[PDB]
């Protein structure tokens, strides 16, 4: 609550560009149980990772994208509700109030669009980037309908403050200290709230005051709308006239604030807004039982605030569409009349880019990146296996050619692997329909392939392709420095063995004639979690198979046994996959300064 | 009794997780492979 408040000055200083309105959104941490990660490494533990969260938009057949947003936040464990609701009293912490097992919380920035032409629909999905493991990141994807539900909770917040104030008054009165002036002024203030409410009723009435969320997050969604206010005022006028007819024919916290400042002697950001009514905008879902509570400032003319009059309602954008749809009893606007299309274009300027049928795309699928990358990886792996099998079929010479450091007593089994090349390639071909597809869908190979295509088609309008931070650092100018080796066993069955590839140095000795390969190593003084598989000798029950790739999509076989094939698949990908399949890729993965 | 009868027994495999008393990140990675049969029939004797 402190970092966000400190960062709010950037949004406060903004005067122009009203299309990005920052607001406070609280995301419950109930879904973190299924994350399967360590919560200790998510707030403050071993600094250096520099975890960041980015927010980006996703358009549909229009082009362009938002240039991300540099925001960050931190979690808070151990009953965050207790320390965010009750004012901070760490020097004099005691048994104050009563609550059940609470949870944590987080604050996320989500820009909103405010303008005379407000409009509202559900066609945009907000993408959230998390700097964690790409394997089962456990992310969420929602449309714009949940972002703006057009509702607020203004009446339910009144009773919440009453329980807290009664509890604090009881706590103050329970200790016999200070002087009788505080007691007498508290009694006078209590009596001033009602004549028969206290003298003939009760002063405090603890009865069953238990801090719980039962009637706060259930009802009160649409209660202060202008139509509801008109109905309420009409009902109150009717009641007033009925009372008048029946009669005609029968047959103020200044002292409290001063005392609180004197006693607590400490302020928290969650106390200044308690004097004014708040707004709650929950948006729950069946995925996890946790409402998405949203708090909006009351002292500013932001979304949901009520300080000068009617707030933003996001209206005048649905009745016209409904009338157009019901005019011809056809839901699809594409098969409507010319007059309806003209009216829709005139009323909605942003809808004119869909009728002209520009930037064609199959249907409207914002979440196409997953299977698009899956198809690209499958095509690349099939091209690679076709190239390797063709080079193996057209491989000249036989057995070993160069020296190779092989022990005399261990060379009797080295040739066995080489003699089983048809079996190995058959197993590789057959494993494409047996191995799981969730193990190679977020590896470094797809990222390197995507970064390789960044050189071609550098935006329709241009761009220097200069990222700020947290980008493809290993793939900046060339892939010949960092290699990716995958270790697989031999025989009639091939399965994944390693977890993360480790680069292996390689050099050529001979500068002509029969080239020789001799791997080397580079001493690193920045990490110690390095496997010993790369440093293993070629002997000791043979070795693995390595197939490196450069920045030009050139693969060099490093299979032991004097066999080495060099094939390029840079032109096979373009032939099989045209340039019309990189639409969303260019729309999303692009940035300029 | 013969009017109402069951069909067969089903087997469900479950897992286990260690206690959350340790804050080490390695405690959330390991997982001991163990379980028990669902509605199984085990006899405490044998027939010669």
From TrEMBL, chain A:
<dbReference type="Pfam" id="PF04559">
    <property type="entry name" value="Herpes_UL17"/>
</dbReference>
<keyword id="KW-0946">Virion</keyword>
<dbReference type="GO" id="GO:0051276">
    <property type="term" value="P:chromosome organization"/>
</dbReference>
<dbReference type="GO" id="GO:0019028">
    <property type="term" value="C:viral capsid"/>
</dbReference>
<keyword id="KW-0167">Capsid protein</keyword>
<keyword id="KW-1048">Host nucleus</keyword>
<keyword id="KW-0231">Viral genome packaging</keyword>
<keyword id="KW-0426">Late protein</keyword>
<dbReference type="InterPro" id="IPR007640">
    <property type="entry name" value="UL17-like"/>
</dbReference>
<protein>
    <submittedName>
        <fullName>ORF43</fullName>
    </submittedName>
</protein>
<keyword id="KW-1188">Viral release from host cell</keyword>
TrEMBL record, chain B:
<protein>
    <submittedName>
        <fullName>ORF40</fullName>
    </submittedName>
</protein>
């Amino acid at each position: 609550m402190e970092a966000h408040l400190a960062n709010e000055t950037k949004h406060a200083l903004w005067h122009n560009d009203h299309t990005k309105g920052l607001l406070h959104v609280v995301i419950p941490n109930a879904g973190l149980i299924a994350a399967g990660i360590d919560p200790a490494l998510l707030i403050l533990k071993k600094p250096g990772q520099r975890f960041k969260v980015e927010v980006q938009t996703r358009y549909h057949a229009t082009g362009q994208c938002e240039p991300w947003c540099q925001v960050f936040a931190a979690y808070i464990p151990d009953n965050a509700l207790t320390n965010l609701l009750i004012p901070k009293t760490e020097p004099f912490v005691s048994h104050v109030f009563s609550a059940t097992h609470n949870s944590g919380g987080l604050i996320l920035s989500l820009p909103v669009y405010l303008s005379p032409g407000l409009f509202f629909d559900a066609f945009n999905v907000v993408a959230i980037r998390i700097n964690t493991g790409n394997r089962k990141h456990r992310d969420i994807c929602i449309m714009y309908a949940e972002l703006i539900p057009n509702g607020t909770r203004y009446f339910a917040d009144g009773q919440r403050v009453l329980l807290l104030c009664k509890q604090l008054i009881a706590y103050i009165r329970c200790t016999p200290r200070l002087a009788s002036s505080i007691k007498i002024y508290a009694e006078h203030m209590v009596a001033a709230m009602g004549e028969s409410h206290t003298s003939n009723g009760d002063n405090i009435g603890p009865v069953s005051s238990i801090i719980d969320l039962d009637r706060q997050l259930t009802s009160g969604g649409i209660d202060d709308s202008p139509a509801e206010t008109r109905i309420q005022e009409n009902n109150r006028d009717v009641l007033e006239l009925i009372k008048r007819a029946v009669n005609i024919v029968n047959s103020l916290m200044e002292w409290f604030d001063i005392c609180y400042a004197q006693l607590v002697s400490g302020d928290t950001p969650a106390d200044f807004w308690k004097r004014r009514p708040l707004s709650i905008v929950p948006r729950h879902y069946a995925e996890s039982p946790s409402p998405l509570i949203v708090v909006s400032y009351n002292g500013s003319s932001a979304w949901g605030g009520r300080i000068t009059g009617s707030p933003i309602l996001y209206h005048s954008a649905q009745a016209i569409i409904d009338a157009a749809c019901i005019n011809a009893r056809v839901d699809n606007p594409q098969s409507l009349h010319v007059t309806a299309r003209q009216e829709l274009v005139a009323r909605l300027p942003f809808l004119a880019n869909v009728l002209n049928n520009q930037t064609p795309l199959p249907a409207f699928k914002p979440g196409a990146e997953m299977f698009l990358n899956q198809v690209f990886k499958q095509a690349c792996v099939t091209s690679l296996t076709q190239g390797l099998i063709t080079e193996l079929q057209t491989n000249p010479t036989l057995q070993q050619l160069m020296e190779y450091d092989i022990a005399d007593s261990s060379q009797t089994v080295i040739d066995e692997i080489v003699a089983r090349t048809p079996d190995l390639i058959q197993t590789i071909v057959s494993v494409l329909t047996e191995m799981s597809m969730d193990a190679f869908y977020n590896s470094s190979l797809m990222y390197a392939v995507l970064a390789y295509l960044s050189s071609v088609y550098t935006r329709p309008q241009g761009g220097g392709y200069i990222p700020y931070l947290h980008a493809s650092f290993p793939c900046w100018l060339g892939n010949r420095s960092i290699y990716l080796f995958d270790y697989y066993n031999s025989g009639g069955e091939i399965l994944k063995l390693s977890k993360v590839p480790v680069p292996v140095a390689l050099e050529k000795v001979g500068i002509g004639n029969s080239t020789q390969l001799r791997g080397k190593f580079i001493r690193s003084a920045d990490i110690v979690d390095i496997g010993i598989c790369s440093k293993y000798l070629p002997g000791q029950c043979y070795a693995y198979i390595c197939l490196g790739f450069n920045q030009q999509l050139q693969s060099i076989l490093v299979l032991p046994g004097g066999f080495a094939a060099c094939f390029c698949i840079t032109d096979t990908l373009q032939a099989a996959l045209p340039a019309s399949l990189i639409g969303p890729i260019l729309d999303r993965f692009c940035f300029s300064i | 009794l013969m009017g109402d009868m069951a069909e067969r027994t089903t087997a469900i495999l479950v897992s286990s997780a260690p206690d959350a008393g340790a804050a080490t990140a390695t405690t959330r990675n390991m997982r001991i492979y163990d379980g028990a049969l669902y509605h199984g029939l085990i006899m405490m004797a044998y027939q010669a």
